[PDB]
């Protein structure tokens, strides 16, 4: 997160850390949607060009964390994944369309003050809130600088949804309906963005109707971090929801 | 930089 602030304790209880057994490292953000299911970006798992292809084996899930680096002794719960499911039509080849993956935990996590699932949007939640100007929130332990620090604590940033045309004209890449961009306009003199290590994390919105937090987007891609006339691209969660439903009542919780 | 985790986990 570029131009964010430290998260308050328990502010983002669904926040997850995708962590590399060896070398021991932070690969991406992710999120808890149930006591056995985690939502992340498929690119954090599979990236042929970068020769990236994480197996259920290569990884660990860390839930309940505040601190980036320390092992949070009796607050954080670290799980092992049972199974990984990537979207059958995830396009690593061109624009990362369907940048989504589900992870089934080897054993169910128990909720507590620092560990709590986020809700998946129903078609109406999506309709009322996913509007240009409406602000959503991104969290991560990612880069603070496109390039130079690293936070020691979870960062937060509130970003407005940017209308489609703007998203489209900001890049050479081919934007799809499974994408939405977020970011301030240079005109706006307000900054912020996800950065390296932020991918797979949640883009959440608070419903004004039932006062619940919903996960609208997944930190997907962008060009550099916090650059003028550029925006963050997020996986449109509601659009990929049937896919989500499918895999959970196929082999899940 | 990263602290170490129990290999109950590794």
């Amino acid at each position: 997160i570029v131009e964010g602030s430290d998260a308050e304790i328990g502010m983002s209880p669904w926040q997850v850390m995708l962590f590399r057994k060896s070398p021991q490292e932070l690969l991406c953000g992710a999120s808890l949607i149930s006591d056995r299911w985690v939502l992340t970006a498929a690119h954090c798992l599979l990236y042929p060009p970068w020769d990236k292809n994480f197996t259920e084996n290569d990884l660990l899930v860390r839930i309940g964390k505040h601190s980036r680096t320390r092992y949070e002794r009796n607050i954080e719960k670290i799980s092992m994944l049972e199974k990984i499911y990537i979207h059958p039509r995830y396009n690593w080849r061109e624009n990362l369309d369907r940048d989504i993956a589900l992870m089934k935990l080897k054993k169910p996590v128990a909720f507590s003050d620092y560990i709590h699932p986020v809700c998946l949007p129903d078609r109406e939640t999506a309709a009322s809130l996913l509007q240009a100007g409406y602000k959503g929130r991104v969290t991560g332990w990612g880069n603070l600088k496109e390039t130079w620090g690293q936070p020691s604590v979870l960062q937060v940033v509130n970003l407005p949804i940017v209308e489609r045309p703007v998203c489209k004209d900001s890049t050479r890449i081919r934007i799809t309906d499974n994408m939405f961009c977020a970011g301030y306009k240079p005109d706006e003199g307000k900054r912020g963005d996800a950065c390296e290590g932020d991918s797979g994390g949640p883009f959440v919105m608070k419903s004004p109707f039932n006062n619940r937090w919903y996960q609208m987007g997944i930190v997907s891609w962008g060009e550099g971090c916090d650059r003028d006339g550029k925006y963050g691209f997020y996986t449109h969660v509601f659009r990929l929801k049937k896919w989500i439903q499918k895999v959970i009542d196929q082999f899940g919780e | 930089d990263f602290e170490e985790i129990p290999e109950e986990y590794l």
Partner: protein, 36 residues
């Protein structure tokens, strides 16, 4: 899990649950033309 999430989904134990508001939530609600 799914269908508009989990159950107690998106209700934070330290915030919504104790009726505490985090430090910037208001900026979000104020963009939705003020929450509820």
């Amino acid at each position: 899990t799914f269908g508009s999430g989990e159950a107690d989904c998106g209700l934070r134990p330290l915030f919504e649950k104790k009726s505490l508001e985090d430090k910037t939530e208001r900026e979000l609600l104020e963009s939705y033309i003020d929450g509820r």
